[PDB]
Ligand binder design. Structure first.
Ligand SMILES: CCC[C@@H](C)[C@H]1CC[C@H]2[C@@H]3[C@H](O)C[C@@H]4C[C@H](O)CC[C@]4(C)[C@H]3C[C@H](O)[C@]12C
Ligand SMILES: CCC[C@@H](C)[C@H]1CC[C@H]2[C@@H]3[C@H](O)C[C@@H]4C[C@H](O)CC[C@]4(C)[C@H]3C[C@H](O)[C@]12C
Ligand SMILES: CCC[C@@H](C)[C@H]1CC[C@H]2[C@@H]3[C@H](O)C[C@@H]4C[C@H](O)CC[C@]4(C)[C@H]3C[C@H](O)[C@]12C
Ligand SMILES: CCC[C@@H](C)[C@H]1CC[C@H]2[C@@H]3[C@H](O)C[C@@H]4C[C@H](O)CC[C@]4(C)[C@H]3C[C@H](O)[C@]12C
Ligand SMILES: [Mg+2]
Ligand SMILES: [Zn+2]
Lengths: 44, 151, 153, 1337, 251
């Protein structure tokens, strides 16, 4: 996908990558306090 | 813009007409660059796809091919048969328009003399051997390609 | 780790506030580290102390001189033989990144312009083989025993 | 009346339109800005005063102590500009600020203070700007270009039916502060307003209103109007409200007003208003869909019957009626115009109270932290509304108030509830069709920031950092005997300034090809830089040319490449307002008369007038001649009646820049070629002798003088002394300043190196006793001739093919052009030799070098440095140096060889400086810098002695010439009031100051005071002498270097095939051949042609200004050849006065009028000797010479009016058919020399990690062979060529030495091997966890 | 690598390796002190982060920066990218025996010949000149030959004219858009510093004479010379490979 802070070059993504990204994307919503930061984990 | 520039360069453009012309100039200058960058993308992608295709055989021995006829868009003909058929190899015998006998037997590279003969007989449908329908494995044969076009 | 060191060496009988028999053991351990593993080219704790002292004595001299001090005035203000100051003022700062962008033409990095100085030039490798031959000629043009004498010597 | 320098050579001027406004100083954008920065403003609003007042005073915890700012000053720079350049150090002044620490004691905080400590602290050095708009940073001259950025304020924009499949237009609104956060108000496709705080997640707009202590009632009162209802069931009717499709038509007075079904029209409203309708009865169902306005409660039990903003139904109406409620309120909302966008936002509002809103904002900004009432209130109150963290500058308030249609320009720099509500109302009105969005390309929405502003914004940053540090320091202790000197360290403050001036995108090396490049570099506007755009995200919207550029930004001159349209040039008359907006002058027109008073209008202020064109014929009294005159209204142009115009363009040049206004016949060139021509004219290289243009536009003198390459007279006078190096002017008595000596000295800049390694040389253009006035040029700089810019040479050119030697754009040149040195240039380069101290011992500079056989040691002196004046060539030694090497380990045959011949090891290297191969010049300068501890070898002492002698001689010559002027003036004063004439000269010179005057006693005390003042001046000059003998001080050489020796070589480059030449019309080419003179085409008189150009290049490239320039140059040179003849046949002035007056009077209603009847005879003959090589001609940009005038001028000389003569072939003598076009064209030598572009490599040095040929010419690198060339070789069958290009020629380490040995053996065969780009790849993959290995055959 | 003035330049991998080693040593030391499990868990997390930054920096974390604010370059960053080895170096490297210059017309030339500056050729063909000098007895050894060519003796020009006699050179113009952007020519030694290009070849290169430059390479092996003469020579390539029409038409 194109972040493009502004509104708008070909597709080369394997479906396997696609399906896996979809599943992890679903998990993000179901997540509660996922933290990928050591200092933050340490404080907690 | 509805009003044109009614002056030419032998005369002079006044300041307003020159100010109008500046837009077109800068637009063209900015375009050219985009065109260059976009033609490079296509070429890189097309050599990535087709880099390892090589002529690896002399004659696969197939009997199939495309059917070349002149291309006509409604009115006149914009590409005759000679341009489309020159330099290729026939897949089937080109029967004389009277259906009498074979004009070019088969597997004949159609050089200029043969094309002149075809124009003489006014035939407008020739079946030629094509790369896309070659029986060779991992490569292409010389007869399904045609001729070099540079040699 | 300094905190662990404190807890094991703390005596409550003297009634010291820990939060004080530790706030030291902790700072000693942070500074010892910042000195022993903060630079790619390790410097002794003594040299680091000296460099920090000079960088300070220098700030004060600049504020009261409206001008950077001179290796001579630094030596005078400090207690150093002047040449020692220049040696400590040479301890190169941290190595530069070899990927530092130096571009605007081809996107080339700084490490691309650093040459190899331990390489033999090809006219010196051809010259060497030419001598290794010529020697065979002038020597062969001699009798066996003397030629072998020269070869062995 | 003509100027002295301009009466020596008057340029004939076409150009029928008169001049009302003279061209301005072309460097006032740079010089005004920095004066406003470094300068003292009482009402501190500009420069450093503003920053100090904005940061100081600094307050610590509990206000126990305060640090007040009093003033500031700048000290004198230690080194002047020339010493800064020679010594390689920044030219700057030290900033010293007097602060005051005040301490508050206990008891009453706001009362007596313990003590006040006042102290001056030195806080960094600020670079100073030269008198030409440049800075010296590290000995190099820099230019800091201006920046065009978007102005702070409120801007309403939309999506123009984009990013929406439906095609709906979503409108937005953004507040942009000078420094702060970006508020916003955008529309969701469901028509709901959502404010985005800092590019964060959007939330409904109403949240913010609730965060501003607003209730729902107040929100509705502000946004919606009110519809009242009474309870039978009567409603008050307003005729205007029911404009119109109604459920119930009307029921007023019972009888009739209008039937049902029919929509209400205008006439119905007219009848209702005429009948005074105020109360009506309507069915209950009509209110079935409305919304109650305010909260309605029941008095029986004090229960809430219905809250505000709730749909009203029949049951609620019945309950209210039976509960005693008669007055029921609702809200208006016609979907067509006054639609409802706030109501939905409230209904979808996740907030009911301010605290919840603050908590939500807290989570959005910094999610995950425990929200707290005090913390959230503080965060919101600090985000905006805080002077420290949010500034809406004076320009921002003006562009905000004006956008919302307020009457106050002045205001507060912080937001408020009123401002936000008004922004919301304006956006809603836009969404309702009232109003329009803004164009973000309009030069009324773009601002210019120049060096003073950018520099003060970086000083304020440093001041903020230091203020934070000081606050921290005073947060603890607050002890006494703490002066304000230990708290302030200068490095943090100076870091920002040094980094900005040194390494920044807008601070760049000045262009010193010629005067034009400097001038055009200084007045340049860039859209890049910090706070601006970037190349990747620019898009073509901002690269276009807008209608508002007219007269402000040049549409022609812009680079062609990655950033075209992002960098522009300031137009000739364009100037900046008090707020940073380009504005341009217009000549005011009263009812009918075109007055002569100019108003400077801005881009937006100009939209609502009708401005006539400069080429608009006017009568002798100012009235427009034609009934209808073409003018440009708001956006477009069209004819207007003469009686409804109010402004007129001030000139025909005011649209173009200075570079594009130097092209004659610009109207006849295609725009692409004009762009190319301006860009190339910026690149011309000055030549040994300068040549004025024969065909110019009149802008040459302005560019030459407003650049500083020339010496211009400050005050008038008579030239007392002239020399190749200085000029001494004896000023007129009218401008003496009685305290002065009366003479001024100009020191010319002799051969000196520019940033492009060209030569900077000034030579005088006056003579002894020659009367000068103020503004007259005294010495021409590079590329100037008698005060006029002169970038090239006048070449005799013929347009014809000639044998394929001008095939594409190639140029054929004569050998007479190369013999006469017309395009020979001087290039100065400097080389350095540094002697460092290695680990094995210091390096030495010596004349004794190992393995050098006295062949290349002749030019060196006894100290090891070349003599000054030596003619060196490639490979010669300039400075002889040796480096200590240790050990060797001789091979087994190198030991035997050393034995037989008994030759021992040198033990030192030969790391000496030598001339780069291919260069050949003379050494014109050598300078040596040594550390403090080093011995200052003999040559260094010689140079120091020479410097001391030169400084003493110059200072003493200054003092004695000034004394001579002083004594002469005193003698002149002594002619009256006790005059001695014969006896005055008898007494010695020293007894002038003791000469008496009228008798008195107070006069004697003044005499003694004057003697004391004179002795003090003597001591002053003596101490100056002492100071100068003191720059014998050691140098601040970088660490590890003992000394540096710099040598300056002056090469003289001639013209040769491969050099690039150009005209002023975008016609460039490469010289292809230098042709003998007997082989060039010639005319019937035997004169050959200098240059032969190809005609086929003109038709396709529609730049036919070069043909007209050639014809007019032929005419001008014809006039010049008829004067050479009369001056060589020694004819009388009467005859030269008649002809030279017939050529200065030719034309069709031209504005110029030269009267050669007021000229002396000595002045008619000095003009005729300056016009004997061609009469100069001026053809303004869009007011040029008509072709008929060119024909007439050709006829004044004896040349054919066709412009074409008949030529003969020099090789055969046969005349060409169909005569050819010959004339004179102005050619430039562009700075693309084939000397600097030819490079060949066989073998050289290699890179360390990727052992590949190095890259470049200095490194003597190789050629890059990339993918598209690999594809080309694969398209052939060239597999061996590819293999040897990939391995043996690039990075096959042991396969490249074997190839060399094989080549020198006559055996052309390779053993390729494996590239080292693959071995490194294997090691890098293997140093991950992967195991990649080469499989056995 | 040491630089001038005592400065040192280092690769970013040294920083990452030092990080990994420091955290590993600290973890080993901390395991022997029987520290509370919070400390050892945090140390193990740090070690994991350091190793992941070494192998692939900023793939899951945010990043790691050095003295500057730029992210450190990791092992994965040295293979991938548009600058990585698997790209840049391996098909787009610098080459020996090459040089560029400006092009002029030279209308007197034949289609198989190009004008080459004598000075550019005395450098490109240097080893050939040394070999042919030593083979004719002009120079006793190779150092002698190096000084003879350095002094530019008279015999050196004759030897150069002999070396260049039949030895093609490849000429290439910037955007190689098709295979006619590299072609082989026989050199003709000329004065000056600009290459002369036969007019009829310009259309193939899309080249004009207003400042354009060309690169020249010299084939070394016998096979490379034969390929230049038989495959790439300009007189063998007069038809366009796109269409059989001639590409050498007068312009
Ligand atoms: C702006 C483009 C980047 C590049 C041109 C700039 C950025 C940082 C600069 C280097 C560093 O300062 C460290 C050293 C300082 C010494 O004094 C001279 C060498 C040294 C390597 C510098 C040369 C050059 O100037 C550098 C590489
Ligand atoms: C356009 C960017 C400028 C770039 C080409 C300039 C700017 C600084 C220069 C380097 C520094 O001097 C540090 C090293 C000094 C050694 O002696 C030679 C290599 C070294 C990298 C220099 C080569 C080159 O000259 C550099 C990279
Ligand atoms: C009379 C008006 C005049 C005094 C006002 C009108 C516009 C104001 C300038 C800009 O607004 C903002 C700039 C950046 C910083 O905000 C402070 C400096 C800055 C140059 C301002 C200075 C000053 O305040 C100006 C000139
Ligand atoms: C009344 C007019 C005075 C004027 C003619 C006299 C007064 C002082 C004289 C100059 C100074 O002596 C300094 C230099 C001395 C050198 O020897 C020759 C040049 C030099 C500039 C002199 C030229 C001339 O002689 C000057 C200007
Ligand atoms: Mg070109
Ligand atoms: Zn086939």
């Amino acid at each position: 996908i194109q972040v493009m802070e502004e509104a708008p070059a070909e597709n080369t993504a394997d479906e396997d990558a696609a399906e896996a990204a979809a599943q992890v994307l679903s998990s993000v919503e179901s997540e509660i306090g996922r933290t990928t930061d050591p200092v933050r984990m340490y404080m907690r | 813009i509805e009003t044109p520039i009614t002056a030419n360069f032998r005369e002079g453009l006044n300041v307003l007409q020159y100010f109008i012309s500046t837009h077109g100039a800068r637009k063209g200058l900015a375009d050219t660059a985009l065109k260059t960058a976009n033609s490079g993308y296509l070429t890189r992608r097309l050599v990535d796809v087709a880099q390892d295709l090589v002529v690896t055989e002399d004659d696969c021995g197939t009997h199939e091919g495309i059917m070349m006829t002149p291309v006509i868009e409604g009115g006149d003909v914009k590409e005759p048969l000679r341009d489309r058929v020159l330099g290729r190899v026939t897949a089937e015998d080109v029967l004389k328009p009277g259906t009498a006998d074979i004009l070019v037997p088969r597997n004949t590279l159609l050089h200029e003399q043969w094309c002149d003969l075809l124009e003489e007989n006014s035939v407008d449908a020739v079946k030629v051997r094509s790369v896309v329908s070659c029986d060779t494995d991992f490569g292409v044969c010389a007869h399904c390609y045609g001729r070099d076009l540079a040699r | 780790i300094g905190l662990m060191k404190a807890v094991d060496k703390f005596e409550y009988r003297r009634g010291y506030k820990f939060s004080t028999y530790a706030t030291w053991w902790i700072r000693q351990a942070i500074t010892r580290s910042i000195a022993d593993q903060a630079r790619t080219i390790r410097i002794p704790v003594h040299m680091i102390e000296t460099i920090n002292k000079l960088n300070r004595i220098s700030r004060q001299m600049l504020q009261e001189m409206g001008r950077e001090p001179t290796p001579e005035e630094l030596a005078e203000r400090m207690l150093m033989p002047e040449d020692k100051i220049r040696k400590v003022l040479k301890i190169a700062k941290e190595p530069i990144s070899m990927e530092t962008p130096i571009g605007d033409d081809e996107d080339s990095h700084l490490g691309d312009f650093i040459e190899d100085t331990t390489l033999e030039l090809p006219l010196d490798s051809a010259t060497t083989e030419s001598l290794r031959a010529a020697t065979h000629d002038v020597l062969a043009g001699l009798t066996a025993r003397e030629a072998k004498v020269l070869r062995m010597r | 009346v003509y100027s002295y320098t301009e009466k020596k050579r008057i340029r004939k001027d076409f150009g029928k339109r008169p001049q009302v406004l003279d061209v301005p100083y072309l460097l006032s954008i740079q010089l005004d800005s920095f004066q406003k920065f470094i300068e003292q403003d009482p009402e501190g609003q500009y420069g450093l005063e503003a920053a100090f007042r904005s940061v100081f005073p600094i307050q610590s915890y509990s206000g126990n102590s305060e640090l007040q700012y009093v003033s500031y000053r700048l000290g004198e720079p230690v080194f002047d500009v020339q010493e800064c350049q020679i010594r390689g150090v920044t030219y700057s002044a030290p900033l010293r600020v007097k602060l005051r620490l005040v301490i508050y004691e206990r008891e009453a905080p706001e009362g007596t203070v313990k003590d006040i400590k006042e102290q001056e602290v030195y806080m960094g050095e600020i670079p100073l700007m030269t008198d030409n708009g440049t800075f010296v940073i590290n000995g190099t001259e820099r230019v800091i270009v201006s920046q065009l950025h978007r102005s702070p304020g409120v801007f309403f924009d939309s999506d123009k039916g984009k990013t929406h499949s439906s095609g709906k237009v979503l409108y937005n609104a953004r507040i942009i502060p000078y420094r702060g956060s970006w508020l916003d108000f955008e529309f969701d496709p469901k028509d709901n307003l959502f404010v985005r705080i800092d590019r964060r997640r959007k939330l409904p707009a109403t949240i913010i209103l609730r965060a501003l202590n607003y209730t729902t009632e107040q929100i509705l009162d502000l946004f919606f109007e009110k519809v009242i209802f009474e309870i039978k069931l009567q409603m008050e009717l307003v005729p205007e409200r029911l404009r119109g499709t109604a459920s119930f038509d009307i029921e007023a007075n019972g009888k009739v007003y209008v039937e049902k079904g029919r929509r209400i029209t205008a006439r119905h409203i007219r009848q209702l208003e005429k009948d005074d309708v105020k109360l009506i009865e309507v069915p209950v169902e009509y209110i079935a869909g409305k919304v109650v306005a305010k909260d309605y409660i029941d008095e029986s039990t004090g229960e809430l019957i219905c809250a505000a903003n709730m749909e009203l139904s029949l049951d609620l109406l019945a309950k209210l009626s039976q509960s005693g409620h008669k007055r029921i309120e609702t809200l208006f909302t016609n979907d067509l115009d006054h639609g409802p966008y706030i109501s939905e936002t409230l209904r979808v509002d996740p907030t009911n109270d301010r605290l919840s809103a603050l908590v939500e904002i807290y989570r959005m900004m910094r999610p995950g932290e425990p929200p707290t009432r005090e913390a959230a209130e503080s965060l919101f109150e600090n985000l905006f509304f805080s002077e420290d963290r949010y500034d809406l500058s004076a320009v921002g308030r003006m562009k905000f108030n004006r956008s919302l249609l307020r009457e106050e320009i002045e205001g507060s720099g912080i937001l408020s509830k009123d401002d936000i509500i008004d922004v919301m109302k304006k956006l809603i009105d836009i969404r309702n069709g009232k109003g329009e969005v803004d164009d973000i390309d309009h030069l009324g929405n773009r601002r210019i920031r120049s060096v003073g502003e950018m520099a003060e914004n970086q000083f304020r940053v440093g001041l903020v950092r230091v203020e934070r540090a000081v606050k921290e320091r005073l947060s603890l202790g607050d002890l006494d005997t703490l002066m304000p000197q230990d708290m302030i360290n200068a490095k943090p403050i100076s870091a920002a300034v040094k980094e900005f001036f040194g390494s920044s995108q807008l601070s760049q090396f000045m262009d010193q090809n010629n005067p034009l490049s400097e001038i055009t570099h200084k007045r340049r506007i860039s859209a890049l830089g910090p706070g601006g755009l970037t190349r990747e995200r620019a898009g073509f919207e901002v690269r276009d040319v807008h209608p508002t550029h007219y007269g402000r930004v040049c549409p022609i001159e812009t680079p062609e490449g990655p950033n075209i349209g992002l960098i522009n040039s300031l137009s000739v008359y364009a100037q900046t307002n008090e707020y940073g907006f380009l504005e341009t002058p217009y000549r005011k027109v009263t009812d009918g008369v075109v007055t002569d008073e100019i108003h400077y209008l801005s881009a937006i202020e100009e939209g609502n007038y009708v401005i006539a064109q400069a080429n608009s014929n006017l009568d002798e009294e100012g009235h427009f001649v034609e009934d209808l005159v073409t003018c440009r209204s708001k956006g477009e142009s069209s004819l207007f009646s003469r009686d409804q115009v109010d402004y007129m363009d001030v000139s025909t040049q005011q649209v173009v820049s200075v570079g594009a206004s130097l092209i004659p016949f610009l109207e006849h060139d295609d725009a692409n070629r004009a762009l190319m021509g301006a860009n190339m004219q910026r690149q011309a290289v000055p030549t040994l002798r300068a040549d004025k243009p024969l065909v110019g536009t009149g802008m040459e003198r302005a560019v030459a003088v407003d650049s500083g390459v020339t010496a211009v007279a400050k005050r008038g006078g008579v030239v007392q002394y002239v020399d190749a190096s200085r000029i001494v002017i004896k000023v007129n008595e009218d401008e003496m300043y009685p305290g002065e000596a009366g003479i001024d000295i100009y020191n010319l800049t002799k051969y000196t190196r520019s940033n492009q390694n060209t030569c900077i040389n000034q030579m005088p253009c006056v003579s002894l006793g020659e009367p000068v006035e103020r503004g007259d040029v005294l010495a021409d700089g590079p590329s100037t001739d008698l005060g006029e810019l002169a970038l090239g040479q006048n070449m005799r050119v013929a347009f014809m093919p000639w044998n394929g030697y001008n095939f594409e754009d190639s140029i054929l040149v004569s050998e007479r052009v190369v013999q006469e040195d017309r395009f020979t240039t001087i290039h100065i380069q400097e080389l350095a030799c540094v002697s460092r101290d290695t680990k094995l011992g210091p390096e030495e500079i010596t004349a004794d070098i190992p393995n050098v056989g006295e062949a290349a040691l002749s030019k060196l002196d006894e100290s090891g440095i070349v003599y000054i004046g030596a003619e060196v060539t490639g490979g010669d030694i300039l400075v002889g140096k040796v480096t200590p090497k240790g050990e060797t380990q001789l091979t087994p045959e190198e030991k035997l060889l050393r034995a037989i011949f008994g030759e021992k090891a040198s033990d030192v290297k030969d790391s000496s400086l030598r001339v780069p191969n291919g260069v050949s010049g003379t050494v014109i300068d050598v300078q040596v810098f040594t550390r403090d501890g080093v011995e200052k070898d003999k040559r260094a002492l010689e140079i120091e002695e020479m410097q001391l002698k030169q400084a003493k001689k110059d200072l003493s010559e200054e003092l004695q010439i000034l004394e001579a002027g002083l004594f002469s003036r005193i003698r002149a004063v002594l002619v009256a009031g006790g005059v001695e004439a014969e006896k005055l000269d008898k007494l010695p010179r020293d007894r002038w100051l003791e000469l008496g005057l009228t008798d008195e006693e107070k006069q004697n005390q003044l005499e003694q005071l004057a003697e004391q003042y004179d002795e003090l001046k003597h001591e002053f000059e003596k101490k100056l002498e002492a100071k100068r003998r003191k720059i014998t001080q050691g140098d601040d050489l970088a660490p590890g270097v003992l000394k540096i020796v710099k040598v300056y070589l002056a090469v003289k480059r001639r013209i040769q095939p491969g050099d690039k030449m150009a005209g002023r019309h975008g016609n460039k080419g490469v010289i292809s051949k230098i042709n003998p003179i007997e082989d060039m085409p010639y005319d019937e008189n035997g004169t050959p042609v200098d240059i032969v150009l190809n005609p086929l290049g003109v038709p396709s490239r529609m730049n036919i200004g070069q043909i007209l320039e050639t014809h007019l140059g032929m005419a001008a040179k014809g006039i010049g050849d008829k004067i050479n003849a009369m001056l060589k046949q020694q004819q009388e002035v009467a005859k030269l006065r008649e002809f030279i007056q017939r050529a200065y009077d030719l034309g069709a209603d031209v504005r110029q009028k030269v009267d050669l009847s007021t000229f002396s005879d000595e002045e008619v003959m000095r003009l005729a000797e300056n016009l004997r090589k061609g009469m100069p001609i001026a053809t303004p940009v869009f007011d040029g010479a008509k072709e008929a005038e060119i024909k007439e001028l050709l006829k004044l000389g004896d040349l054919p009016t066709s412009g074409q003569i008949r030529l003969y072939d020099g090789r055969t003598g046969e005349q060409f058919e169909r005569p050819v076009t010959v004339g004179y064209m102005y050619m430039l030598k562009l700075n693309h020399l084939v000397d600097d572009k030819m490079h060949a490599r066989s073998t050289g040095s290699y890179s360390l990690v990727t052992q590949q040929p190095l890259g470049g010419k200095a490194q003597f690198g190789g050629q890059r062979f990339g993918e598209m060339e690999v594809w080309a070789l694969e398209a052939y069958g060239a597999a061996y060529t590819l293999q040897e290009m990939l391995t043996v020629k690039s990075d096959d380490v042991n396969g490249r030495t074997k190839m060399y040995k094989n080549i020198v053996d006559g055996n052309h065969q390779m053993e390729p091997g494996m590239p080292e780009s693959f071995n490194v790849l294997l090691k890098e993959i293997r140093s991950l966890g992967i195991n990649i290995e080469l499989e056995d055959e | 690598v040491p630089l001038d003035g005592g400065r040192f330049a280092t690769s970013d991998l040294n920083d990452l390796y030092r990080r990994v080693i420091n955290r590993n040593n600290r973890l080993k030391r901390l395991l022997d002190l029987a520290a509370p499990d919070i400390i050892v868990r945090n140390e193990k997390r740090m070690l994991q982060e350091a190793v992941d930054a070494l192998l692939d920096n900023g793939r899951r974390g945010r990043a790691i920066t050095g003295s500057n604010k730029r992210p450190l370059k990791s092992l994965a960053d040295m293979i991938k990218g548009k600058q990585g080895r698997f790209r840049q170096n391996l098909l787009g490297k610098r080459v020996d025996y090459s040089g560029r210059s400006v092009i002029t017309v030279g209308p007197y030339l034949r289609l198989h010949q190009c004008g080459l500056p004598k000075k550019m050729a005395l450098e490109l063909f240097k080893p050939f000149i040394y070999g042919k000098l030593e083979l004719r007895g002009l120079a006793t050894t190779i150092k002698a030959a190096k000084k003879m060519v350095e002094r530019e003796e008279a015999v050196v020009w004759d030897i150069l004219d002999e070396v260049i006699r039949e030895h093609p050179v490849l000429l290439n113009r910037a955007p190689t858009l098709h295979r006619l952007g590299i072609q082989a020519f026989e050199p003709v030694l000329i004065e000056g510093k600009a290459i002369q290009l036969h007019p009829l070849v310009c259309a193939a290169y899309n080249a004009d004479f207003d400042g354009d430059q060309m690169a020249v390479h010299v084939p070394l092996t016998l096979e490379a010379q034969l390929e230049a003469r038989a495959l790439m020579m300009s007189t063998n390539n007069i038809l366009s490979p796109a269409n059989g029409e001639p590409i050498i038409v007068p312009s």
